[PDB]
Design a protein around this ligand. Structure first.
Ligand SMILES: [Zn+2]
Ligand SMILES: [Zn+2]
Length: 42
């Protein structure tokens, strides 16, 4: 799985081991803790 899983910036700069990608932009806006995903933790 690639491409951002939120704003679909167009490509996945970081494909988490959970299949939840997140472009840098977004990754630079979210705190991100526990090397987890916001779509899962919630
Ligand atoms: Zn994004
Ligand atoms: Zn996840």
């Amino acid at each position: 799985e690639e491409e951002c899983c939120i704003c679909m910036d167009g490509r996945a700069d970081l494909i988490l081991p959970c299949a939840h990608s997140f472009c840098q932009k977004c990754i630079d806006k979210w705190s991100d803790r526990h090397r987890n995903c916001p779509i899962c933790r919630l």
